[model samples]
Target: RPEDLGTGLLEALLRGDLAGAEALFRRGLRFWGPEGVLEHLLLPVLREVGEAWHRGEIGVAEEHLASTFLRARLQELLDLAGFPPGPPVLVTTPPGERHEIGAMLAAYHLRRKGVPALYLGPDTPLPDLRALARRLGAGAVVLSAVLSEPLRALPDGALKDLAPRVFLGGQGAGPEEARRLGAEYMEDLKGLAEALWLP
Candidate 1:
């Protein structure tokens, strides 16, 4: 049933039917709730779209259009969740990394867990991130990147002074690398939720 909705969403995106895609997304949210829709519907559709583009089943323009629409929907969900009262968490991507959907999801997950999260989006310099975290007295700083190059390029212990807690994730992040950087590795949204739940 959820997979059927995902298929519909994929078809709508491929057809460039923004309204239809939005409607399907809304329907998914209504049936599954925000977290379930995101995990089961939206993320799967995006993954399929990316695979389709990679396989040459879709054009770059279409992929871009779909991504833009999906990003807008994710932002809407983030806005609806809003911030809660708690020690703030700052979520962002390191400099030179443009992929931000993972970070946005992290922010949403944190807020939904009753943690106040500030989403700084992509290409955030480490220095600026540190400054902002300090200024806001953030309890955590979550940095995500989809490419390995940027994560490898970061100096060891780069996040040591960033915040009380530093969470590194996305495709680029690894447990060993996170330890080297003096941060914790977040495998995925589920991992984050588990970490937040622990003492």
Candidate 2:
């Protein structure tokens, strides 16, 4: 089974293996987890693939394909999650940010954990996010940044003064930004799942 080619593929993914992991996704094995698959499989795989592309290994098309596949799978799982607790959450990528796999994966994982999430997609305007944040009256907003430079700058900018508590995660965040935001920074899905009460 493609998904069950786990030991090698998943471990490679965990170790930041792009070529090895892309081999699995390009083969058409979609990842799924009852606790939350995106956090575990899909997001991690894409993160590595993106890194590999930046390092001049994988090409842009493969990276897009992997991201597209993961998004579709994540939507399927999230749509199928029934009887949720109705905890609305706002999710978004900052302005000038278009990559969305990480944000969707976070929302999907949060929903499966019983907290319903509102996923505001990529390149969202800061004012719009602030408006949505006001409308949802949410417990938190899961903000993802795969761009290291912008992610670092956010804590002192728009992301800091947002109404809801922010749960920052993704490839871009580090310990310093996490503390500056005064929010929990989740580098992995497992840790986030437990924090949001999914585990």
Candidate 3:
């Protein structure tokens, strides 16, 4: 039953059935709430889409269309969720790391948890990230990536002064690598929530 939920959503996406996909997302949201839909439904659907593309079951056009649709839906969700008053967290990906669904999810999760999140999306230069953080007096900067090279290529301590806290997430990041960069590593959405939760 649980598997069918994601499968149905994936099928809708792959078929370019935007209305059906939106309906499925709404059903999940009604039953599971935003976080549940994100963690259990949307994330799994995204992974499935990626895998399907890799397996040659779907073409790049289908993958991109699905991603674009998902991205728009996620943005709408974030807009509806709103944010509480706080020093906003800046969420983005480092330069050359174009994948951003994970980063957008991070921003959404943070907002749902009552933290104001400013999502800058993908391929953000470190200098620009730092500048925005400084201008906004951000409480944190959260970076997501799917490749190790860009994260590894970051100049040591480049993010140290970027914000009061700096977090790295996604498959590309590691605890040791974050430590080397003077930042913290969040293994997943739960980790991010726990790390930023006030006592």
lDDT of candidate 3 at residue 49, scale 0 to 100 = 91
State which candidate has the highest lDDT: 1
Greater-lDDT candidate between 1 and 3: 1
- lDDT tens digits by residue: candidate 1, 27-129: 9998999888888887888898889988999998898888888899899999888878767889998788988788999988877777788898898889889
- Rank order (by TM-score, best first): 1, 3, 2
lDDT by residue (1-27, candidate 2, tens digit) is: 644654455455445666776676544
- Tell me the tens digit of each residue's lDDT in model 3 across 174-198: 8888888888887868558669654
Model 3 earns a TM-score of 0.90
User: Candidate 1 at residue 95, lDDT?
Assistant: 81
lDDT of 3: 0.84
Candidate 1 ranges with C-alpha deviation above 4 Å: 191-199
* Residue 67, candidate 2: C-alpha displacement in angstroms: 2.1
Best by TM-score: 1
Query: Any idea what lDDT model 2 has?
Result: 0.66
Error of 2 at 27 (Å): 11
